[PDB]
Design a protein around this ligand. Structure first.
Ligand code: A1BD0
Ligand code: A1BD0
Ligand code: A1BD0
Lengths: 710, 710, 237
């Protein structure tokens, strides 16, 4: 934050000489001087380099509208205008609102002006920094000696060891000096909500449209556990999205609560759909309560918004129709809502208080914003017991929080403020839309197969595209209108292999092969389905990465059409089993995997298996408790009918839980067993594509076992 | 790790010129060349700089015993010997065991030798690095493009923002690039225990003398909860150290487990003593089970070893005598055991398998070793159900672990390997002992008051000093012999105010004032008691910090004797309340606090309050569940007698839980109430010394309230 | 107050190279480094140059009695001892009374030691400065814009005039920037005996063995008139 831009190269000594003296004086204050050639050059320089901390220009040459253009991108960016002919009568109120400091041309005045510019730079840094992060930076500047934990003592222990010195050099001195504990009392305490930490929370609460905000250092898994534990005492009933993360299952296995599951939809690709509106109706909930033993009217409800693939709910309807006092939205995938108007009414915090209800949002700051991993936010709108919620929060938060993660959470809040943050979010949205349009365009010019994007046909402007019943791009059957919206940030690319009606095509390219190819060429997809790939076009994706992705996809298509050897096209896959892939070509491998999927009819089997709910003999807490007591045995896959499952069965695809602890497979739920057996059979044919079923254990004979209650 | 030391100043061109050529060629490979003046200079240089990666010396001038001296400090540090007169007949087997590579003198041979030295440096780095950290570093060197979480995409989003650019510049590019998720499949999965992660675990298990090892990214709080949840099913009885961390209390509030509390001792200073051997006897436990309602024979037992003040147990006796199938040692404060012989038999992992028992150790790697905060280890010795334990582990571990914390854990394991790690631990122990001896010496030669050190009178050699019933330095009454030992690392300094018999002196200086003075002068103590101050002499403490501490203590004594103004001595304290501290001098403030402590008789009241156990109406789980249901009201301090506490009451001092959730104060436990009232009265007299009682809430009127069940 | 004396010419790399690095890091912080040839040279240099703000020496070569000799001339002058063989057991209470800060020899540790020495230099300057003078210097460092008397506004009016510019160059910028009035409320008021002014009086009273002290800006003529007028009412002898 030490780059100062000086405009103009005028030809009068009485201006150039003071500017050269000021250049020397600023360099004496550790500033880096850059010289844009014109106004447009300066604007581009500001737009591309966030470390530009100041602009110096001649007022005689440029009017104060240049400051308006500068403030359109960064309203806090200090501007220094040198006045020669204009006086105090040449400035208006609107101009006086801009962040301009006025200086004059004079020999020998460079030291004072350089000091003024230094003070202005410090003030700008102070203004844009959030409170807790600024306090942490100041503490690191202090350089105090610690005799407390962590114990590496600001990295000294690492510097005393060779391997530790490598670690120190990799992570740097500042990452070690900022690693502190509550023994440093000037920083306050995360658990006590005191000092800068306290202000941090309020800062966050104002940035994310929340009444109360809590910082979590063990991810949205821990955030979900905290919210669920405060909301649902032992013996209560909770509505749970079936498309819930495994953390909700862990919470259920932790606390004795009775679950009643919302039933979401899906398509042929295996993309999880939204919960139909009827499932939020009071009569449906009452019927499920009556049909569920030891179940009363639910006191908490958890909905996944959005889904992994980017399907957001109209949350106003849910907040109005869900007759539950506590509504929690697992928004791990959408922390950027409230920073763009396209998400209005599509998130838990949207709007104001709900009478007689409390609304929670759990957000993975580290997922779609800029924050270190495990950084999570809990946002509360409504009435809570602050003491009791603080107890539930302390039971899951460590007494030695990582200050880097907490500061990253606060800095993520800070990065969303002002014109710079608005431009960040809007630019990411526009980049994703441009990539989607380019994928469609390339598909049009392509002669033969090419990747498609799972989206509406004619996307034009920046918005969350609604999923209507008339259209068939989304693949959902009889969908509710004004219910589900597609997030433009989450870009799903489709590989060939499925038809418009949901059936399989004669040929197809499993998306896992494309994922491996991208990995070999330095591109990491977020996740891969049977014929879909998810790419996150977050604030961290630039034009370079999008163009590289396009080039890699085109190169894959060219290589596949040429039918190259798997040895050369996928070197890592060949290294997995050189004998099996010695002479195989990419087309033969892709067609073999597609033929396995088609002959076993994976899409229909997966859909049928996930549209029938296994019967709940006991809640997950009871099954886990009897598992901890040793009352469990390992049986084979085919013998699981009539057995109470002890663990969660989470297969890939589709990547969501199919069987919950305390659930039993019957003749009605036999599709679950045959889908699992199909997955086990398919995963044993190609050495680089194994069966991935959490909760199932592969034996030496290749058979798969599950753990069930005796 | 690019510093090469050349020990050579010969006066022959046929050696000098090839060495100069080698210097230029090594500099071309980005090596920093240093020139020690002699053998002793080279040895000191190696001892003081862990970034030295190679030694080049002339074999004619120096025999191979110099390599022996080098390997005494670093057995992997490559040595390059230039042979002129010696041949293959001049090397013995013992010399051949040393890591020495032989070269020859020749013009024009510098490039090949420099390449060989580069390969040797890379081999050295590879040899000392642990596997998972090496994989992380290699992945960062790859520089791939991510379309997955975290979403800052290696820090790109940070570089696109001004405040984010400040954050990026502070933490550095490598910290942000190493932040990844399981979408990068080559690094494996911590949750799945696959790939390099798996190797890391095995590596850790071999370094810490554990059968199995698990890495926790949410601290020893989460590690304790995982161990307890696996070991204690709902409805089971657990033996719990009363000197337990709040995490064990949180686990009891989470799971319906019935606790039976061990009773540790304490001294006049409030230092928590060890649990007497009688509490571990089968008859005592059986009697407690008979008296405790809804209690069976305990299936789990948790012991805090060591204590906060550094008291380790003879763990062999506990393992032999404690008739519990599951014994868990909360060793958050002692992760360096197994790395020094003085701790033999003083930790859970010491020795081998206990027949019919499982032993757990929970270590805060980030507390006394070199690791990032929240890094913890679970060490298991004995038979466990790996699948059930893995489920319990997943229930508390986030699906997006901080890879930096995981790598810091592995690097902490690697830092203990070899002669360098042995020298690190031994140097820390010897530094702590030298500081203790210096404190004793300064006390002996001081005229008047001086800081004391809680230790035996005649500490000479490096060992854990036993606490004998004959000596009275430790202040414990009728202690068992060969039971408790003092860890030399944990240095407790005593300020005047107490007497040798346990009563308080006429005058005294509370340790909080000394703590504030040290904070003002850049020294952070671990924690402060009424008259004691704890300092951690970890591997991160050097001679510089120890001498700085001594200087600061002498400065405090001088300033206090001069009776300076509080305005000048403690500027922050005066800034808290300028009107109250306007004319106060340090002696008056210290004497006022000491007079309050004496008049209220804090030591005797605290001892009595922690000597009587409050009666357990219900276990903490029941109280917390009924608190989550709104069945809790708020009463004042004087009205808690006969009420069931809803939350744990943790007073400071002594910093350990006094009242647990579900416990009720009676006439037998009225000293608890008197002690709490005394603390509330004492904390309202000086604006910088407030009452610190977790679970008690100060109101506007100044009175303190606690909440109980209605 | 930026002259640091470094005292040794040892013949070992593991000490010489860190000292050279510290020399570079101290020059980066605007310090002037001097190299006395021996102990007596250093003592004479300290005696003859009050602008010496620090002494760096090797603890192996010189015991802490050299710090005693230095403190005999200036008890607040910071000394920096580099410890190699001596440990915490080699220092006594009397030595611990001296204003010595201890460092170690290590490559790459120069920036931290330079920052520590800078903080020590600032503390030394603060300790020797009186309160009101310190406040005036700090205010001048703030560089505020005044719309109040004196009216030259920190010397701007002098810089706007040729003869005024000669006057300004002669008297210097700090003299004109420190010439302020009570409109700057943070400096307090001499007439009201408030703020740093009040502290100044107390400071003066302690230094001159007086119960009360008053500052006069019009000489002992005015001081005598004040004392006499308070002491001698009209009509007295
Ligand atoms: C809806 C929802 N709610 C909560 C959480 C827990 O949040 P976390 O602890 O991870 O911060 C997640 C986490 N999903 N990601 C993990 C894998 C890590 C990311 C790999 N690129 C998974 O797929 O299991 C979630 O999807
Ligand atoms: C016996 C025992 N067992 C487990 C834990 C949890 O380990 P953690 O989650 O913190 O890694 C702790 C934690 N003690 N330290 C914390 C914070 C200290 C910060 C200043 N140095 C506290 O005082 O409450 C413990 O003392
Ligand atoms: C006993 C006594 N009491 C008070 C004062 C007034 O003090 P002042 O206003 O000057 O600060 C003076 C002043 N004497 N100085 C002048 C000579 C000027 C300096 C020549 N080098 C004189 O002799 O006339 C004094 O001698």
């Amino acid at each position: 934050m030490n780059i100062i831009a000086i405009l103009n190269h005028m030809g009068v000594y009485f201006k150039e000489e003071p500017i050269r003296e000021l250049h020397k004086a600023l360099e004496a204050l550790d500033f880096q001087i850059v010289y844009p050639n014109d106004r447009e050059d300066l604007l581009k320089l500001i737009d591309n380099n966030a470390r530009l901390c100041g602009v110096i220009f001649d007022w005689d040459t440029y009017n104060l509208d240049l400051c308006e253009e500068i403030s359109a991108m960064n309203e806090h960016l200090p501007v220094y205008a040198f006045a020669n002919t204009h006086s105090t009568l040449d400035v208006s109120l609107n101009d006086l609102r801009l962040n301009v400091e006025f200086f004059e041309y004079a020999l020998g005045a460079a030291q004072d002006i350089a000091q003024k510019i230094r003070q202005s730079t410090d003030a700008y840094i102070d203004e844009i920094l959030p409170p807790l992060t600024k306090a942490l930076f100041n503490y690191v500047k202090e350089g105090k000696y610690t005799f407390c934990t962590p114990g590496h003592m600001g990295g000294t222990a690492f510097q005393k060891s060779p391997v530790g010195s490598i670690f120190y050099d990799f992570f740097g001195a500042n990452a070690m000096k900022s690693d502190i504990s509550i023994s440093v009392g000037e920083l306050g305490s995360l658990l006590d909500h005191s000092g800068p930490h306290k202000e941090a929370e309020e800062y966050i609460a104002r940035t994310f449209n929340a009444e109360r905000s809590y910082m979590v250092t063990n991810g949205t898994s821990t955030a979900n556990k905290i919210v669920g534990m405060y909301s649902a005492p032992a013996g209560s009933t909770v509505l749970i999205d079936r498309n819930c993360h495994k953390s909700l299952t862990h919470l259920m296995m932790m606390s004795d609560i009775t679950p009643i599951y919302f039933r979401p939809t899906r398509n042929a690709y295996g993309i999880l759909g939204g919960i139909p509106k009827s499932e939020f109706q009071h009569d449906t909930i009452a019927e499920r309560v009556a049909q569920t033993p030891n179940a009363t009217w639910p006191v908490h409800a958890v909905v996944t918004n959005s889904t992994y693939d980017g399907l957001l709910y109209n949350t106003d309807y849910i907040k109005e129709a869900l007759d539950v006092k506590s509504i929690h939205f697992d928004s791990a995938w959408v922390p950027y809502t409230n920073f763009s108007p396209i998400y209005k009414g599509l998130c838990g915090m949207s709007g104001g208080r709900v009478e007689g209800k409390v609304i929670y949002e759990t957000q993975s700051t580290h997922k779609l914003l800029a924050a270190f991993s495990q950084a999570s936010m809990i946002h509360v709108k409504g009435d809570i017991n602050e003491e009791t919620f603080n107890e539930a929060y302390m039971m899951h938060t460590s007494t030695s929080p990582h200050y880097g993660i907490v500061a990253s959470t606060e800095t993520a809040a800070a990065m969303m403020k002002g014109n710079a943050g608005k431009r960040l979010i809007n630019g990411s949205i526009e980049r994703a839309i441009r990539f989607r349009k380019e994928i469609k365009r390339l598909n049009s010019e392509s002669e033969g197969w090419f990747f498609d994007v799972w989206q509406p046909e004619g996307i034009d402007e920046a918005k969350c595209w609604p999923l209507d019943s008339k259209d068939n791009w989304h693949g959902f059957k009889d969908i509710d209108n004004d219910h589900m919206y597609l997030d433009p940030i989450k870009v799903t690319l489709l590989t060939p292999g499925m038809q418009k009606d949901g059936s399989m095509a004669d040929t197809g390219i499993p998306a896992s092969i494309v994922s491996k190819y991208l990995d070999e060429h330095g591109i990491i997809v977020e996740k891969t389905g049977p014929y879909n790939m998810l790419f996150l076009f977050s604030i961290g994706i630039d034009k370079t990465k999008a163009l590289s992705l396009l080039r890699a996809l085109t190169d894959f298509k060219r290589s596949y059409d040429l039918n190259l050897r798997v040895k050369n096209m996928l070197p890592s896959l060949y290294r997995e089993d050189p004998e099996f892939y010695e002479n195989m070509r990419i087309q033969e491998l892709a067609q073999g995997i597609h033929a396995l999927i088609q002959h076993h009819n994976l899409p229909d089997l997966m859909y049928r298996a996930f549209e029938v709910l296994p019967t709940m003999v006991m809640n997950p807490h009871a099954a886990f408790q009897m598992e901890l007591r040793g009352q469990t045995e390992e049986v084979y896959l085919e013998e699981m009918i009539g057995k109470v499952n002890a663990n969660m069965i989470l297969p890939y695809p589709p990547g969501v839980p199919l069987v919950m602890p305390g659930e039993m497979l019957t003749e009605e739920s036999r599709p679950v067993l045959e889908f699992l057996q199909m997955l086990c059979e398919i995963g044993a044919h190609y050495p680089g594509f194994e069966t991935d079923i959490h909760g199932a254990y592969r034996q030496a004979d290749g058979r798969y076992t599950v753990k069930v209650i005796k």
